[PDB]
Structure formats: C-alpha cells, structure tokens
Amino acid sequence: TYLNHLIQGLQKEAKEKFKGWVTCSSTDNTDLAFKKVGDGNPLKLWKASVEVEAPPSVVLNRVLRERHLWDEDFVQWKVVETLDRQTEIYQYVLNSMAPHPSRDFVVLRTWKTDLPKGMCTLVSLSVEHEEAQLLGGVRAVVMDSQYLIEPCGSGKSRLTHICRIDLKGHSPEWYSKGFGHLCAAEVARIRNSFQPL
Template structure:
C-alpha cells in the first residue's frame, strides 16, 4: 500500500479480527510502544523491535506446502542464500510492524472512511457465526400480532425439544471438565451452525418457585454487569419480550460496546402442569432500537426440578452467539462461562453471599 493508505488499511484489517485476537494484538503493541518510549535506555526503536519480532508474529519463511516449493526451499537454504522474494517479505513485515508499533494508539480506531462510524457495531451487517436462519429459533422480522404469535409458537416447539435434551444423558452429549458440583456437557448440532449446545446442572438451596421468580427478574444479572433490564411487552400471561443491557468493559486498553439481549421469553410456573422452566430466544421489536452489540440467543432454557426439601436441581441449556467472537473462542470458553453462571446463581441464595462479577 502507498504510505498514505497504510494506516487505514491496517485499521480496516484489524476490524476483521475476532475480539480476542484484536485484544491480544492491542495488548502486545501497546506494550511494545512502552518499550520504545525508553529508547534512550534500551536502544529499541520501532524498527529494532520489528526486526526481532516480525518473523515470529507474521510466520515468515514458512516452508511451502506443495512438493515443488519444498524442493525449491531445500535447494535455496542449502546454498545459504535467501531469494529476493523472502527478502522483500521480511522487509515489508519489518516496516509494517514498526509502523503498527508507532501508530498503536490510532490503529484500533475506526478508519475515517468507515460508513456510519458513529453507530454501534451491531447492525444488520454484523457477522454471526450461524448466519440468518442458523440454530433452532432465529429471530423473525418484527411485525404485528400474527408474526408475534408465530414466533411464540416456534419458541414453544424449541422449548419442548430443549426439555428432551435436558433429560437425555447420553445421545450425542460429551462430558466437559467443570468446577466441583457442576455437571457440564456439550453437544455438536447438525443444523449447519458451528456453535455447540451447552448443558450444565447444579443443585440450588431454594424452592422451585422462588428460584424461577429470581431467574425471571434477573436473567441478565449473571451474564456480566447488568446496566438495564425491563419487560418491553407482555405477550400473554406466560410470555413476554424482555430486554437487558450489559455494561461494556472499560480498561486501560480501550472499551467494549455494551452487549444487548432482546428476548422473547416463555415460562411454566405451575408444578401441576409439568416441570417448571424459563425459555427464551432472540427476537426483534419495532420500539427497541439497537444499543451496543445485540447478542444472538439461538436457545436458552432453565429447567427447575425438585431435589428435596427446599432444594432445586437447576439445569441450564444455552447456545448463544455473543458476536465478534471466533468459533474457537466459543468452543473453549462458553462452557466455563455457563458453569460460572450456574455457580453464581447457586451462591446468590447463600446467607453470606456477596455479589461478584463473573
């Protein structure tokens, strides 16, 4: 790229990274910038740092996969002379990393040309791992009572399927390591969405109805720092549109936009009619503008079963795309977050409970 376009090109490329990769890169570059600030003592200019780190950071000089390239590489290194292409790649990587270190503060801003850069990064064009139609219950376009009823019917079907999954102990489920007293497992679904369905169970020292009431009124509390929560619309005596907004993280390396959950929820609160549960999926509502990053909840179920006097066995099934995260992140982290959430719910009923952030 020409020099006057290198910064915006790097800014645009960084926007394509998953959140966790972007955070790691920002941490590294800001650290290297601090190192450069002590250049009088350590002689480490941006170029000197780039000479040391660019080959590792950009994986330069990797052997080619095809046989011809492998033979060429072997011949080249046996002669002890790198070819011109390798030299050019090394020079470009060194100059690129040196520039990234120098521009570390501006590198993670929106490029000036970015359309709607004043808007939140959560509109229709935002990437979702499952895409439109992925998962058991994707949100339909907002509309009138007919569409709302159709959405509620789909949620009911999804809930019945999740209730079966909650009781199924083997078919397709794989156990996963978890903290003591939490049973954790995941299931790879066959609907084209790469996200796993997670299931966790824990015993809570609380009656079923009391636990259900707390889940209804504080559903977003255990997902992070709750900023706002409200019932947007009462659809029927046992269903509603519910919205919660989680506070974005602020720290020395920048800030993250708040995360929003807009859910269509239904519940069963009468033990004589069957097991108690709270089930929800993402939805849309014409009176609720997007604020922050709107998560895509494909399925979320809390199943409450009696486990003795004033005790409840709480089973939680969840499949949520928080947006901006890679599939690998979801596979490695989602289960631990679900287990932490269950423990936080359990501990909230203990007399010595103090509210802590997950």
C-alpha cells in the first residue's frame, strides 16, 4: 500500500533530540507536560499544574495531612517512622477503579516551608520498611515525586506536581498519555477541595 508516515517517524526523531518539557492537552483548567529522562527507562517524568485559592503552607498541609479531603481512593494511612521534625516514612493504599488490585505505597517524605520567595515543597520516594508489610495489592515505586507550591497573587498558590511512578503491571502504551491525565486530575482535586462546595 502507499501511505508514507515518515511523519510519525519524524516526530519520534525530533522528540529524541529534545530533553525538556513536551506540553499536552489537559482538561479542567490544568497544565500538563512530559519529559523523557534519557534514563534507559521508558517511564516518563510528568508535570501537572493548577492555581489554587489558598496560600502555600495551607496547600502544603492539604497535601501532607489532609488527602482524605481530596482523594476518595486514599484508604489506609500511617506514619511508620518519624526520622526528624520534617521527614518521615509514610504508608498509604490507593484503591483501584476496575476489579484491579490496589496500588500500595511506602515512602520517605520530607517537606519544607521556609524556602526563599514563600515556596514550599514536599518530596517523596518509595522505600521499604520492616513494619510496612503489603497492606493489599501491588507496591508501586515512586521514583520521583515532588510538590512545588509557590505564591502567586493575594493568598493564592501555583501548585506543581512533578512525578514519575512505576505502578507494577500495566501497559507502556498506557503510561504513554493516560497516566498524565491521572496526574492532572490529582492536582485538580486538590484545587477543588478549597472551593466552597
């Protein structure tokens, strides 16, 4: 047959050259984008944004201690160990939509509220703990996860989540674009949970 799609070849060629953020279409007023790390790992690094009607340190507490207020799937949670005033081992479970197993998490988080220019950050990465035993389905691997919250406007914040998770056992042809949408919706829910509703 005759149909040259060297086009789809030429895009895949220019993306390989590029090492920064590739933007996406995103619903419900969010900014999505991705990035190939050049890792030797197919998994993309994603970056979602929103403007949220609350000052940074509030938004930070909303992500850090109040996620039952914005995630209907967020089920079992416990601080597993406290390492210092601002770092800990946290363990939660997320329930899954279809008859799948649950995605499970055990993470080192540290957070920071006294950064220059009113900035706050929460950062996470998966670990194992001698006391955090499979609370259900499938251990994920938070390879990267970082919330950057910065002041924009009068008592409002720009919330940005850059992450890269390896849930263990779905298609690479699913984390190609579908995962990004899940990120943009997490960050939209956080926003919604500060709207009189």
